[PDB]
Amino acid sequence: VDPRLYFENRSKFIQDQKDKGINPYPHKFERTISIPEFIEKYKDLGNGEHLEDTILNITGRIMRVSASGQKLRFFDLVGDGEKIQVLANYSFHNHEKGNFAECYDKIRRGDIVGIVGFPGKSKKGELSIFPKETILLSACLHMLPMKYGLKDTEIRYRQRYLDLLINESSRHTFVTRTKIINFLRNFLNERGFFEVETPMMNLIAGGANARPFITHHNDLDLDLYLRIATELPLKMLIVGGIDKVYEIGKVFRNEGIDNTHNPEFTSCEFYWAYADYNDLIKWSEDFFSQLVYHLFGTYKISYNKDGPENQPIEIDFTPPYPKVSIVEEIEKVTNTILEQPFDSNETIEKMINIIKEHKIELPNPPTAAKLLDQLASHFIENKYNDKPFFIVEHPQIMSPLAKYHRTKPGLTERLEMFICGKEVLNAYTELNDPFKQKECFKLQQKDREKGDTEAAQLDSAFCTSLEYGLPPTGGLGLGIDRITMFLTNKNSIKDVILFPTMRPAN
Amino acid sequence: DPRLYFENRSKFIQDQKDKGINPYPHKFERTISIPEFIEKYKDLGNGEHLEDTILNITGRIMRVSASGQKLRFFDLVGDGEKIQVLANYSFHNHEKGNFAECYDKIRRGDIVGIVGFPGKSKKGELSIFPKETILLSACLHMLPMKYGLKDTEIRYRQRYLDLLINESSRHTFVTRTKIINFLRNFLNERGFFEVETPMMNLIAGGANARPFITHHNDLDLDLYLRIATELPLKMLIVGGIDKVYEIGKVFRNEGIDNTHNPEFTSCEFYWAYADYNDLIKWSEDFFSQLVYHLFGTYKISYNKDGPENQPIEIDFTPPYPKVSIVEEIEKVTNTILEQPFDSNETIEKMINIIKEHKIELPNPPTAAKLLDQLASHFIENKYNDKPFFIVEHPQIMSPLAKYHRTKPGLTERLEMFICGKEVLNAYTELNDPFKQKECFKLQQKDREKGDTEAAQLDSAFCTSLEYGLPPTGGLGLGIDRITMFLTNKNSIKDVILFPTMRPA
Ligand SMILES: O=c1oc(CC2CCCCC2)cc2cc(O)cc(O)c12
Ligand SMILES: O=c1oc(CC2CCCCC2)cc2cc(O)cc(O)c12
Ligand SMILES: N[C@@H](CCCC[NH3+])C(=O)O
Ligand SMILES: N[C@@H](CCCC[NH3+])C(=O)O
């Protein structure tokens, strides 16, 4: 009932051990077997069967404490996501090492123990370890919370270790996360790609439309910006001869935080020379279908779109995925024609009127790109929840780094894959013409002058790199944390990140 | 003059746009790559022509030559390999353009799309005979020769040029990526689990270094970039992931030199129920197997004093030498460093030792910095022919280290060095939270003296240890420095694609 008193008493316990000779935190306890390999090595065992001649050294954490008297103690030893029962029988205690009750009465829930025992099964058939001596390795000073104590509380985020020990779903989630990353890294290596590392601190943060962070190097007396994307240096590497290049790493964006936006998130960007929008479309379908089948043995997975209480929807990752032109669908749903130039006063004022007629939120500044973005968000992003789908051919005012469309004026050969109305992939034929790239950078500078602090700045080093010849390439970016959210059935981005960015407790 | 040539090529591209032809085509289907092409038709004799195999090749023209007007020769480079391209007026498809007008516009550095057939020249050089050549992406500037990248900083700013010209840089970065690949697989075979800890934190802990500062606007919160991945990984050990690790970037706001880049790649791994000895064995096994995985031997040739001097033989054959820091300093300096090491007497003693030897006194002459300087000038270069370990560091220097089980005042720590450069840091993790807060408060006392790189107390980490940190052994690897020695490089900038530098 009193956690503060419990902690103070356990602290006194540790000090009392030090005063009365014993060391509560020993340096080494040479383990012989792990709990998973122990379960695997002795599960196929008969009821009540004992192996009193095979002594083993096993470690673990106590999570359940109970006793059937002063001579029979019961515990639950967990380790590596698995668990076994500890059946301490006084008939088996090595009395040369110490008193039975004196040794086991000190054990508390959460204590990390080292056990010298023998394997067997109980009368009821519970696979257990029968110790001959139990030594405390690392005591737990606080009271462990209950599962309900972590249900709708932020302790899962601020104290992830508690969430990893109490909830099995947490360990499962992060194991699946690393499996997603392993699958992607191998999927790219098997195709001949080359993993690299581009700087996170830069003189100019380009590659996306977002406000970056700023830091300062004292010895150089230089202001560096945290990378918002890895697009630019990767294309610079494509120029360098590495025709198959990619990077898996953290990117930072200083903007709002919600269930889908963490200030720092893991992204994967790959550049494939002599490839185009079609190649990226096929790549996306192939990769997602195989990733989902690799993790579940099926193409249809269930996802609780409306939270855990409401019923879930079914997402079918079976290719091919629907392709939806942004401009044309907005036209059909709104029964209007967005005459070009899309950034003209007429088209901008028109889109403003359609945003006002539907009482949709007006973006500030009302740049043409933000108007089109809000229109696509409120009218075509949630068009399909049954399966993932592609929003393609974005206008040039929205894609300053995109190569212009070969048969559609004003549009680009860009694609964006969405899952449950959430952007998870951004791919497109790279704009390799420096003459036309500088025009988009200058137009972005004007947009920046209108209050659009997300408008891409002018990177001179990247432009000069394009001047030596960027072969026709195709690039794609993946939001790994979001992919994990959908593939692990989690509604928040804080549930797929070990230590998410939280409001400080001060 | 390069300016005139860039302007001529620029006007050239504009003339192509006004003339009707698209200078940067959208798509060119490649049927075979340069490596596959060398592999597929290398065995052809000098003079054979498979005129029926119409292939689509791609690459960057790196040499332009001619024999009259009917013969044009170029070097097509791609994926680190080079082939010949022999354009003849007999095989040219005249329906798509004039031969001379089509090939006179190709210069060195142009990305072209060739449609031809494989064959071998009269001299025997594997070649692609094109029937049509299309300019896919033009090179507007003058690509320099290899000599143009020797006495300059261009290799670091325009890494693409160094990768396209110096064929050794490509090998160096391929080796770097292979080193990381080997490390990741090496850990995964032992059951380790890869994770991702935050790079922005309320406190920058895990090492003795000055961090960078940044600010999140919506939260109006100042955050420090991580200087190490130690504390969050240990908290994960407490969470039940007994074999965890992370290979990522860490940021330290310090000075720049040949072995220091503000941002560098490190690998920290925490293995529960392990200790100082297990880490020693792990380091020896890993370095020996990595070296033999790359070179087929345990001996490496490294130009320790630059390529202008004879190199040395680094033998990674286990087992390496182990040296106690305090013991060696007392032997080499013929002095007695008494405990407490941070006492005024021994602090003045180390200061006088540095003074009589004419060494630079650390910025704040603290006991930890003093010991570090003594080790750097009297121990760290004891072995160059083989990597070696500096062990049993004092607790004053290791606030996150578990005290030595038998040597008072020391810790069960180890640092491996190669040619005097620290490349590994491992030690038995301190799991007693009370001793931890004691060491952290001591670090604060040393911060009061003006130590910007003294660890600040992380309340979250201390609270994490209170729930029970099992005996664990932790280690950290400096990937960039390891790559430097395995690629025979004297500067860290030579192993980082884009090192931190001043603006142009
Ligand atoms: O996860 C994220 O994904 C994306 C969009 C993502 C689409 C696919 C290509 C990479 C980017 C943006 C974003 C912005 C934030 O400020 C925080 C975030 O976590 C994200
Ligand atoms: O490479 C580096 O290695 C180390 C030391 C290294 C030892 C092994 C464990 C990881 C750290 C420190 C350092 C500091 C810098 O400011 C810049 C750098 O590049 C480095
Ligand atoms: N960097 C892009 C995604 C990859 C684009 C690839 N050409 C982004 O921030 O969305
Ligand atoms: N964080 C350490 C490496 C890991 C030491 C073992 N926990 C360093 O920066 O040197």
UniProtKB/TrEMBL annotation, chain B:
GO terms for biological process: lysyl-tRNA aminoacylation. One of its GO terms (cellular component) is cytosol. It catalyses: tRNA(Lys) + L-lysine + ATP = L-lysyl-tRNA(Lys) + AMP + diphosphate. It is an enzyme of class 6 (ligase). Disulfide bonds join C439-C462. The keyword Lipoprotein does not apply. Its EC number is 6.1.1.6. One of its GO terms (molecular function) is lysine-tRNA ligase activity. Residues 173-503 form the Aminoacyl-transfer RNA synthetases class-II family profile domain. InterPro entries: Aa-tRNA-synt_II, aa-tRNA-synth_II, aa-tRNA-synth_II/BPL/LPL, Lys-tRNA-ligase_II, Lys-tRNA-ligase_II_bac/euk, Lys-tRNA-ligase_II_N, Lys-tRNA-synth_II_C, NA-bd_OB-fold. The keyword Nucleotide-binding applies. Keywords: Aminoacyl-tRNA synthetase, ATP-binding, Ligase, Nucleotide-binding, Protein biosynthesis. Belongs to the class-II aminoacyl-tRNA synthetase family. HAMAP family: Lys_tRNA_synth_class2. PANTHER family: LYSINE--TRNA LIGASE, LYSYL-TRNA SYNTHETASE. This is Lysine--tRNA ligase. It comes from Plasmodium falciparum (isolate NF54).
